[PDB]
Amino acid sequence: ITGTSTVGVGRGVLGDQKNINTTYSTYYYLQDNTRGNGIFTYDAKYRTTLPGSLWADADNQFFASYDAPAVDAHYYAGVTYDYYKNVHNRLSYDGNNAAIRSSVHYSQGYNNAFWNGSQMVYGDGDGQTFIPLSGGIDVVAHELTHAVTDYTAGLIYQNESGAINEAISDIFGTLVEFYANKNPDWEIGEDVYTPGISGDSLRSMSDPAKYGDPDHYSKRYTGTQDNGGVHINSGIINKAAYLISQGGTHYGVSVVGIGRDKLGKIFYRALTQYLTPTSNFSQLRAAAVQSATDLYGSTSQEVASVKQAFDAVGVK
C-alpha cells in the first residue's frame, strides 16, 4: 500500500519484545519499506485461501496473542533479507529485490510451514507438535532459502536433488540463526517444536540420526514416501555441512573444520553458480569442491576439508 514508513512494537511467539517496520495509511500495516521492494505480512485467518489480507492494525502495537506469529514472520523475514544482502550481496530471493510475502494463521492446527512457489506460509501448529512456526528464525530462513533455491539452482523437489534442496534450506536456516546470534545451534526447529518436551528438535545437523535421519550415504532412504525422502536424506548433506564448518571424525574419517562463514560462502557459490535442477549428491560434492577452489585455491585447506566431509558421509 502507499503510505509512510513507521515503526511499531510488539511481542513474538516466544514472548520477546521487538520493533517492526510498518506502513501507515489509515491503519498500520505489516509492510516494511526499508528492505528492497518491501516485506509484506498477511493474515490467512485460519483459512487456506492465500495470501489473505495484508496485516492491518489500528495502533501500531502488536502485543495480542493473535499478533505474535505475524510479528515474528515479519521480523525474521527482515533478518533473513539482511543476511543475504550483507553476507552474500544478494538482494532478496530473486537477486533483484523482489517483494517478500508471508502469510500467518494458515489453516487450523497446521503443523508446518512452506514456500508455495510465490510466498511463505506458516501454520499455527496444534500446540502439541508445534507452536506457531514463524517463532523459529531457522524455520523462516528455511522458507526464504527455498525461494532462493527455486530462483537459482532450481533443484527439483524429489530424490537426491530434493534432499539437496532441503539441506540448503536447513544450512542457511542455521547460518541465519547464527547471524542473529540468539541461542544459535545446529538443530532445526527447536524454538517451536514440542512445547512440552525440552531439548528436542525436528532435525539435527550435528547428529541427524538422533531423529532417525541418515548420516551416511549407505543409510539413505530409497523408498517413495516424502518425495523420495527429501526431509530424510537431507541429513547426509546436513552432516557434511556441519563437518565442513565444525570438524570432527565421523565413521573414522577426520575433517578439519573451516568455520561457518566459509561454509556459507562455499555453499552459496555452489547453489548459485554450479548446481542445476537435477544435481545429485555426487554432483553437489563436485560443485562444492569447485566453489572452494574458486574462493580459496586448489591447494587450500578449504578444498581439502570439503573433500574430507563428503568422504565422511560416503559421497564420492
Ligand SMILES: CC(C)C[C@H](NC(=O)CNP(=O)(O)[C@@H](Cc1ccccc1)NC(=O)OCc1ccccc1)C(=O)O
Ligand atoms: C508445499 C508443501 C505443502 C509441501 C512441501 N513442503 C513440505 O512438505 C514442508 N515444508 P518445509 O520443507 O519448508 C519445512 C518447514 C519447517 C518446519 C519446521 C522446522 C523447520 C522447517 N517442513 C519440514 O521440514 O517438515 C518436516 C517434514 C515435512 C514433510 C514430510 C516429512 C517431514 C513443498 O515445499 O513442496
Ligand SMILES: [Ca+2]
Ligand atoms: Ca494493535
Ligand SMILES: [Ca+2]
Ligand atoms: Ca536455537
Ligand SMILES: [Ca+2]
Ligand atoms: Ca536451530
Ligand SMILES: [Ca+2]
Ligand atoms: Ca520441544
Ligand SMILES: [Zn+2]
Ligand atoms: Zn523445506
